[PDB]
Amino acid sequence: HMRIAVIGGGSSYTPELVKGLLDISEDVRIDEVIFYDIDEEKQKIVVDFVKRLVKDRFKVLISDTFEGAVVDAKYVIFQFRPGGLKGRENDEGIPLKYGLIGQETTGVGGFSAALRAFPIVEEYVDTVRKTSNATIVNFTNPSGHITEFVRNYLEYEKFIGLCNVPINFIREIAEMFSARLEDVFLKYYGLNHLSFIEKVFVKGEDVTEKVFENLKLDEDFPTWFYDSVRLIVNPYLRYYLMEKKMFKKISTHELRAREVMKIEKELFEKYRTAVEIPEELTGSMYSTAAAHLIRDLETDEGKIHIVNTRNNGSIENLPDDYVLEIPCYVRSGRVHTLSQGKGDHFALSFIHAVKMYERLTIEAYLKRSKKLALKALLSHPLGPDVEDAKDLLEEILEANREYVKLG
Amino acid sequence: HMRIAVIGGGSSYTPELVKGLLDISEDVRIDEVIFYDIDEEKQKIVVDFVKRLVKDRFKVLISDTFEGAVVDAKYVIFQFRPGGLKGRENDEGIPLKYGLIGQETTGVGGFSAALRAFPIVEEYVDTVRKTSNATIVNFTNPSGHITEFVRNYLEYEKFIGLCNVPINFIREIAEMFSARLEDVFLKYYGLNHLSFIEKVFVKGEDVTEKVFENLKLKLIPDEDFPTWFYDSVRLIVNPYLRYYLMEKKMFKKISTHELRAREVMKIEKELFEKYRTAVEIPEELTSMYSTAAAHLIRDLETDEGKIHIVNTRNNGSIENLPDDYVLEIPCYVRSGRVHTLSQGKGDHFALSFIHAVKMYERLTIEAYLKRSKKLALKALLSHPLGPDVEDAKDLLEEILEANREYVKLG
Amino acid sequence: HMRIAVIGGGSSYTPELVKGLLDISEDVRIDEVIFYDIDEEKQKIVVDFVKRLVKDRFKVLISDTFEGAVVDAKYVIFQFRPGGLKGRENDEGIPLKYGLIGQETTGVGGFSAALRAFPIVEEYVDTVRKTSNATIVNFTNPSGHITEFVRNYLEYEKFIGLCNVPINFIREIAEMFSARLEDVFLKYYGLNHLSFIEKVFVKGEDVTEKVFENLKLKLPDEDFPTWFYDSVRLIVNPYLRYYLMEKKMFKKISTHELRAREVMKIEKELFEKYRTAVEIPEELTKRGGSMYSTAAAHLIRDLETDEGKIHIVNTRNNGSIENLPDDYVLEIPCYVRSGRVHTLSQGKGDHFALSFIHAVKMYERLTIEAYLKRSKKLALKALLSHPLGPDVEDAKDLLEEILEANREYVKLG
Amino acid sequence: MRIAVIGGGSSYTPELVKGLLDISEDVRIDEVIFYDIDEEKQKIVVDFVKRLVKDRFKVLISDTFEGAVVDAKYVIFQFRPGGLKGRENDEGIPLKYGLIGQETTGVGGFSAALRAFPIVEEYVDTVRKTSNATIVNFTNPSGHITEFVRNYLEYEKFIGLCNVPINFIREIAEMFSARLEDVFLKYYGLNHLSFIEKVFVKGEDVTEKVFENLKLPDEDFPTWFYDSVRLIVNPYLRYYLMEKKMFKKISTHELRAREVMKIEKELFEKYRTAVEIPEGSMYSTAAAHLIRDLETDEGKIHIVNTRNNGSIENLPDDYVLEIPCYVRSGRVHTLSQGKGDHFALSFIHAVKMYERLTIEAYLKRSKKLALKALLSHPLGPDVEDAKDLLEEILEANREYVKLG
Numbered sequence A: 001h002m003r004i005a006v007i008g009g010g011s012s013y014t015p016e017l018v019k020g021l022l023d024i025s026e027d028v029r030i031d032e033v034i035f036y037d038i039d040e041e042k043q044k045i046v047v048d049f050v051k052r053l054v055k056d057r058f059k060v061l062i063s064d065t066f067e068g069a070v071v072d073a074k075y076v077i078f079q080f081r082p083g084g085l086k087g088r089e090n091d092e093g094i095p096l097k098y099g100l101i102g103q104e105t106t107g108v109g110g111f112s113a114a115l116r117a118f119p120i121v122e123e124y125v126d127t128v129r130k131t132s133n134a135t136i137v138n139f140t141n142p143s144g145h146i147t148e149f150v151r152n153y154l155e156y157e158k159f160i161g162l163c164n165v166p167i168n169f170i171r172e173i174a175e176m177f178s179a180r181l182e183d184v185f186l187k188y189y190g191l192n193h194l195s196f197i198e199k200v201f202v203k204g205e206d207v208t209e210k211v212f213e214n215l216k217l218d219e220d221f222p223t224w225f226y227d228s229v230r231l232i233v234n235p236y237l238r239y240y241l242m243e244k245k246m247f248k249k250i251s252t253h254e255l256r257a258r259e260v261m262k263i264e265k266e267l268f269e270k271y272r273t274a275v276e277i278p279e280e281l282t283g284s285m286y287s288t289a290a291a292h293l294i295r296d297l298e299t300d301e302g303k304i305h306i307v308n309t310r311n312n313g314s315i316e317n318l319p320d321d322y323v324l325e326i327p328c329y330v331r332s333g334r335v336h337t338l339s340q341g342k343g344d345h346f347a348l349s350f351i352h353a354v355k356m357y358e359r360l361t362i363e364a365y366l367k368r369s370k371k372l373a374l375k376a377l378l379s380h381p382l383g384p385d386v387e388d389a390k391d392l393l394e395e396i397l398e399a400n401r402e403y404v405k406l407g
Numbered sequence B: 001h002m003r004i005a006v007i008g009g010g011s012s013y014t015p016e017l018v019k020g021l022l023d024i025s026e027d028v029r030i031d032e033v034i035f036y037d038i039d040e041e042k043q044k045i046v047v048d049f050v051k052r053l054v055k056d057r058f059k060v061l062i063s064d065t066f067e068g069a070v071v072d073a074k075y076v077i078f079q080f081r082p083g084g085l086k087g088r089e090n091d092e093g094i095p096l097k098y099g100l101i102g103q104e105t106t107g108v109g110g111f112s113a114a115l116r117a118f119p120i121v122e123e124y125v126d127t128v129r130k131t132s133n134a135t136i137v138n139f140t141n142p143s144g145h146i147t148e149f150v151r152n153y154l155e156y157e158k159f160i161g162l163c164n165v166p167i168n169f170i171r172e173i174a175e176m177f178s179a180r181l182e183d184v185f186l187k188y189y190g191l192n193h194l195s196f197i198e199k200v201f202v203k204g205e206d207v208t209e210k211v212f213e214n215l216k217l218k219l220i221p222d223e224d225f226p227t228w229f230y231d232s233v234r235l236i237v238n239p240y241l242r243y244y245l246m247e248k249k250m251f252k253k254i255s256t257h258e259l260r261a262r263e264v265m266k267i268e269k270e271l272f273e274k275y276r277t278a279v280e281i282p283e284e285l286t287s288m289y290s291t292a293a294a295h296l297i298r299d300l301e302t303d304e305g306k307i308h309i310v311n312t313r314n315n316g317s318i319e320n321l322p323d324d325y326v327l328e329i330p331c332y333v334r335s336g337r338v339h340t341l342s343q344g345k346g347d348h349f350a351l352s353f354i355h356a357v358k359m360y361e362r363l364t365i366e367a368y369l370k371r372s373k374k375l376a377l378k379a380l381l382s383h384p385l386g387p388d389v390e391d392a393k394d395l396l397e398e399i400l401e402a403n404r405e406y407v408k409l410g
Numbered sequence C: 001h002m003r004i005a006v007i008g009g010g011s012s013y014t015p016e017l018v019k020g021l022l023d024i025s026e027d028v029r030i031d032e033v034i035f036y037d038i039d040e041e042k043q044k045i046v047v048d049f050v051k052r053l054v055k056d057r058f059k060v061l062i063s064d065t066f067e068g069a070v071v072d073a074k075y076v077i078f079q080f081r082p083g084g085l086k087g088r089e090n091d092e093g094i095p096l097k098y099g100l101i102g103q104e105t106t107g108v109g110g111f112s113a114a115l116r117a118f119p120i121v122e123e124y125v126d127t128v129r130k131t132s133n134a135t136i137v138n139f140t141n142p143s144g145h146i147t148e149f150v151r152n153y154l155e156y157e158k159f160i161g162l163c164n165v166p167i168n169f170i171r172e173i174a175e176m177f178s179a180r181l182e183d184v185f186l187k188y189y190g191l192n193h194l195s196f197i198e199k200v201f202v203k204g205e206d207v208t209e210k211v212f213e214n215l216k217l218k219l220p221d222e223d224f225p226t227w228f229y230d231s232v233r234l235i236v237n238p239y240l241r242y243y244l245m246e247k248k249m250f251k252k253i254s255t256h257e258l259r260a261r262e263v264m265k266i267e268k269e270l271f272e273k274y275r276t277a278v279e280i281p282e283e284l285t286k287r288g289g290s291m292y293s294t295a296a297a298h299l300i301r302d303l304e305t306d307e308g309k310i311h312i313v314n315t316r317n318n319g320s321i322e323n324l325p326d327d328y329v330l331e332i333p334c335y336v337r338s339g340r341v342h343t344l345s346q347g348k349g350d351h352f353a354l355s356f357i358h359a360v361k362m363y364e365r366l367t368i369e370a371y372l373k374r375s376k377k378l379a380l381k382a383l384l385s386h387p388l389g390p391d392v393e394d395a396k397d398l399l400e401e402i403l404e405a406n407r408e409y410v411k412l413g
Numbered sequence D: 001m002r003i004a005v006i007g008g009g010s011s012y013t014p015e016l017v018k019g020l021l022d023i024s025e026d027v028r029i030d031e032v033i034f035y036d037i038d039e040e041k042q043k044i045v046v047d048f049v050k051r052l053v054k055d056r057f058k059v060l061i062s063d064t065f066e067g068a069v070v071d072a073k074y075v076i077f078q079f080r081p082g083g084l085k086g087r088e089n090d091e092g093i094p095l096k097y098g099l100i101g102q103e104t105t106g107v108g109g110f111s112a113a114l115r116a117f118p119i120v121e122e123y124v125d126t127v128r129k130t131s132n133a134t135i136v137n138f139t140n141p142s143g144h145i146t147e148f149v150r151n152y153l154e155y156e157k158f159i160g161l162c163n164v165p166i167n168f169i170r171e172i173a174e175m176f177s178a179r180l181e182d183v184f185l186k187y188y189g190l191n192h193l194s195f196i197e198k199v200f201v202k203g204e205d206v207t208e209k210v211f212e213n214l215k216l217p218d219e220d221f222p223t224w225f226y227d228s229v230r231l232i233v234n235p236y237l238r239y240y241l242m243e244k245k246m247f248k249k250i251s252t253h254e255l256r257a258r259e260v261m262k263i264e265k266e267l268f269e270k271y272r273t274a275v276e277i278p279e280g281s282m283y284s285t286a287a288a289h290l291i292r293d294l295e296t297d298e299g300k301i302h303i304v305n306t307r308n309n310g311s312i313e314n315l316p317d318d319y320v321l322e323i324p325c326y327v328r329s330g331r332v333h334t335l336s337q338g339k340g341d342h343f344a345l346s347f348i349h350a351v352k353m354y355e356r357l358t359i360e361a362y363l364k365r366s367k368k369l370a371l372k373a374l375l376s377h378p379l380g381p382d383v384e385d386a387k388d389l390l391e392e393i394l395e396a397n398r399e400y401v402k403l404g
């Protein structure tokens, strides 16, 4: 008997998650999927749509409580968004007036998002740990930072951080070369939204050169960049390496949050009567990453998945306990890190810097300290100068006063 | 186009290796297998037997030189025995006179086997390196020790040490639980002939406790580890550990019986005679290392990804041991590459043995590189099963006299 | 105001310690030295002798309790022997019948000595921690193993393990070259009673070769021959003999009186002399480990001032030997200044030395774990891991014997 | 015993020689030999030197670098590759891209390094194949040059010095009325990128009191910053932590190099006739004291640039760091300090990665890899400005560096 808990069932991505679950239900047994959400009305619409898609292939349940969802669960998926789109709007917009990048996961936006998430994830990991001891698969942002927090501070081992960029990238290369997903093997490492690809293999063949060539054929890295750095770079690195250009673009356009308010409102209307997943829905591929991971956690085949976990030797010149986004051998409930060699100095300058920042943030959270928050904020590469840091922090703390208090 | 070189064609294990290569030739392209040996008359009988088994499914060739074999080979299998069974006989026989364990791969006998191998493998790695840059798959003993030497001193990356105990153990477990070889997954670490298993998984299920229980029911019994030992140590232990943990008992056994090398001599000589006329592999042969080699080569060729226990650099597989120790450990093998997998921490009890003989392995290598009799004494004294200071000068002199043709130290 | 507690004040070595304390009392201020011992009658004799030597240069006190000795102390010196000479006699003699080395600190003898010391040191460190938080300076054996235990399990930072073989060696070298103690600088590392010297400097000059050459014209059958030093190229702690000359040491130990029994005779003779002596008796001066005293006093001295001096002590590696984990408690040279111990960089350790250090360190930690869990099964595992431990066929009976002999001090289940 | 001085014409040379005179009582110095590419400049300086020295040791000029370092036991690097005109370009060109322009920090330090590598490579090589002297380095950027020599040229006896550690200790000793050697620091970081966590004076932890006194204008760190961060920070961090404020300051004034040029020209003219030293000034006391303590068997603490080797436990052994070392008889021993703070580690890791990318770009003479190095510096260009910035730098340093 096998049950999957979904926390944040009201999410507009839920339907693609269920499609993934339906696709794997032929290979592994799923008796029930149970949904929990703080917003009951929004989840009911979604879950009614889900019921119509499942057609009784497994049971679809709603729990009124988080504990009721997770108590008999073998897997718990975190899909919730602390503070909601209103929080994300604050995250993106507040840093702008200081001349800083405002973005959901990167920089000061990621910092306030993290402060909102930590108390909720703390409460949730404790409950899971006192009951089912499930494996937790996390999408909640910021995903890598939360993983660092849970793995090295709460010390819950079966917490796996996921993101959609690895799977989107493998998908790209597969269609480029007309091969299957698992035919693609990468040298890949970094932090969630801060990742680097060094080698690309397809069916065993080294096609790195061909990937670089194809990337060529003005918000995008120019050609000379790839020739210089020789890494395929996470698109999110644009906020670092093209800061002035990104700032100008964010600050002269509607906040991204506000725009997804409109998209979400539209999808919910469609969900009332929809018989199949609406095109306007189709980070959509997060879903396939979750379901394939659960699938390969369930069997004894042994498969490669890029996930957020402790380095443990994946990258030889980084400390073992850094949570990284890296390729692992996944089999029967365990995740094994795979040897990759040395990481490039360019990549490591980013990885170290934000690893230090994100640990300063965690410490500041754990001690509920304004002083240490300032120290965390000054350390982020896209953080404030000294002259703006106090005002910025106060603004962040006031906006997040329902979620966290620092003294 | 794809060629495999076999170095030591005359081995009496050769037919098994070729059976293996025949089995994989359906999943993987093999155009030719070429054989080399220093003993042309021995090899000729073996290869003749081989030709009757192969039946032109691939091309079978003999080369007159090492270089002729390895040029244009993608894989090179070392299965030669430096100094022959007479060397083995000196390895086993000489320590005995000093009250020391005499054994092919363990202790002083392994020391002398190492010194015999190093000059040949140093020549062979050199030629491979300057021609084909083939992956070498090593069985030549002592295999883990030779691997340490090639990886960290000659610095040739594509050198993979193999051994027979991992495969035999997995095979045992699979039949215990009625499962396939690959259904079995181990937490396994240590040195060649000095390994430990901490966890056994069959089809995902942790069956470690059941493996311990069934070892209790296994059945000369007072020459194995008693029940309480498994209860105390909580490791499944390589049977070679008996030479360390039960030294007095094992010494008594070895020194009141025919030297093993002498039984082997007789076995090999009866096989050899059967090879002159056999149309199928005989039973006196059956032994299963030559399915570890074929499977490795196969999984090195495809893009499937498969687990193999092999001798290679730790690289984080055991987190509380240095990256550069060559260990016998599970690896993910795929498309020419061998990746170490996380296993967490090693047990303090296993680590005590691993560190000590690793240090002895490096001292022996260093004594060989400087060709130093002084440094050889130092290496000998460092082995847990080595001589006391009062016996060391004489033991070394006797070993160096016996290995005159193979080793020269100043 | 500055107080030193001496735990095990009844020890026959106390008079040499006090003499060291007297030598330093000119450089650093000592107001009082307070003594504690479980044996009150034996301590009274020794302390009456001490009072006569001190001549009111500082106060000499006795505390009837451990807590009363350490409560206001800045330094606490551990000088006690858990289980006494009777315990030591069991440690030396029990292993003999199994064909094993029986010795005060090395092998099976050190294992049972550790098992007796751990509960007492737990109790004592806890009391020091809850009161004065003094720096503890340790001679109680096995000193290196107890340091490993306190530093990495009890996690009490100001616990410094000492031994007398470093200072005895430095003294030899000074005399050999006519130089002062501090003019000697060593590359030195290992475990207590398990140490190795790679380089010797005198007044900045590398004199290693001269030391090796001199070691030979030191005329016998019981010590390393000349080819050994030429092969190994390390000056080795003399305790290494039990490892590298096992067969010869076993026969020596088994064919003479147990060492503890003959020390009972030496001690009983010293105590009679202590009743009336006005000066340190010679019989004490040339024996056992008499210069431990000078090690303790110079350490305390240099912990008190801000000069900065080198002392070989037992502490965490922390980069002294780049070849070993940082947390290994090692016996190594440290820059000692104002209450702190700073490890000094030394480069790589030799493979030969490392094989010993690794092996014994793993044994040490297995023993600690077995103690902490009060586990008979884990104690077996520890015993089988020692390079001088029993074979499988002997291990159970040998553990049983040890546990019965130490039943007043520890219980394992 | 002879000392070689590479850069004899430096306007700092009189101070170095004063220091060498102060130690010549505790240690034997037979001769100090000077070399410079600018013979006319050096001649005036060395003549002034000869009047100060008064034959207490022999003072010599050599016409070649080789002539100076042959049979020297110590060799002091105090030359400035490309001169004050180099520094002017280092300071001025970044400005045009909205970047901090400064002698040793950021893009200005990048071009200074590229200018120094060819010369030090040649010099280290000559020393190694002749006398095998200890080289004491002041040539900037000193920490970066030391990373280069220790880890790429792999010449062990090369010790990087800098001015800030001694200046700090001097402030502290005066604050508490103690000697220089009474002060002990938990000190770590890179050159011009350093942090103090603990201050001890005569064994007393006076860190708290150093914080309080620092509190007792708008161009330095405010009080809350020390309360937050709890590190005493090198003043150069302002270019990182207060970039906007520093950029506005540097970009609205004459370049620092111009001030220095006027100061040096005034001093040089004074040297023609001076009988005593007139009114980084005292790094030429860290050099003499280092050489002194390398010579005796006392053992003394000096903060210097060298391999970490476990001095900071959570940093790799091979990072060259500016850290306290036990100095005795030709050797430099690192001392245990425990762990480094995450905040200071973020800076150290980043600039260290940038340092190695820069050296790697130099060794392969690669324009491509230089762009990579430039992009990696926390104070480097955005992608949109990188190609032009690099071209401008390469154009300016035509005579010293050539990249393909």
Ligand SMILES: NC(=O)c1ccc[n+]([C@@H]2O[C@H](COP(=O)([O-])OP(=O)(O)OC[C@H]3O[C@@H](n4cnc5c(N)ncnc54)[C@H](O)[C@@H]3O)[C@@H](O)[C@H]2O)c1
Binding pocket: A007, A008, A009, A010, A011, A012, A013, A036, A037, A038, A039, A042, A043, A079, A080, A081, A082, A083, A084, A085, A120, A139, A140, A141, A143, A162, A163, A164, A165, A264, A283, A286
């Ligand atoms: N890592 C990735 O590639 C990736 C991709 C997409 C989304 N995400 C993250 O997943 C989350 C999904 O958010 P979304 O885009 O659907 O926006 P959203 O705000 O609509 O969030 C989804 C649901 O979470 C619920 N929720 C909020 N807080 C909760 C809590 N404390 N407990 C239970 N439920 C709670 C809300 O009611 C909402 O229905 C966000 O954190 C988002 O950033 C991550």
Ligand SMILES: NC(=O)c1ccc[n+]([C@@H]2O[C@H](COP(=O)([O-])OP(=O)(O)OC[C@H]3O[C@@H](n4cnc5c(N)ncnc54)[C@H](O)[C@@H]3O)[C@@H](O)[C@H]2O)c1
Binding pocket: C007, C008, C009, C010, C011, C012, C013, C036, C037, C038, C039, C042, C078, C079, C080, C081, C082, C083, C084, C085, C120, C138, C139, C140, C141, C143, C162, C163, C164, C165, C267, C289, C292
């Ligand atoms: N590390 C070294 O180089 C070194 C050198 C000399 C002695 N030691 C050790 O120091 C200790 C001193 O022993 P010793 O040789 O003087 O002989 P000893 O056996 O006579 O013991 C010293 C005194 O300690 C007292 N004592 C025993 N247990 C005690 C306890 N639990 N609390 C307080 N006092 C206690 C006894 O009454 C005795 O008078 C021993 O452990 C010895 O091995 C170590």
Ligand SMILES: O=P(O)(O)OC[C@H]1O[C@@H](O)[C@H](O)[C@@H](O)[C@@H]1O
Binding pocket: A104, A141, A163, A164, A165, A256, A260, A283
């Ligand atoms: O702008 P949105 O529709 O909210 O999507 C934003 C999403 O972009 C993806 O690339 C990231 O991996 C997600 O973690 C992120 O949340």
Ligand SMILES: O=P(O)(O)OC[C@H]1O[C@@H](O)[C@H](O)[C@@H](O)[C@@H]1O
Binding pocket: C104, C141, C163, C164, C165, C259, C263, C287, C288, C289
């Ligand atoms: O037999 P003993 O007189 O008691 O001597 C035993 C002493 O020997 C010394 O070499 C050791 O360093 C001491 O730790 C030990 O206490």
Ligand SMILES: [Mn+2]
Binding pocket: A143, A162, A163, A164, A165
């Ligand atoms: Mn993502």
Ligand SMILES: [Mn+2]
Binding pocket: C037, C038, C039, C040, C041
């Ligand atoms: Mn009493």
Ligand SMILES: [Mn+2]
Binding pocket: C038, C039, C040
């Ligand atoms: Mn009593």
Ligand SMILES: [Mn+2]
Binding pocket: C162, C163, C164, C165, C289
């Ligand atoms: Mn001792």
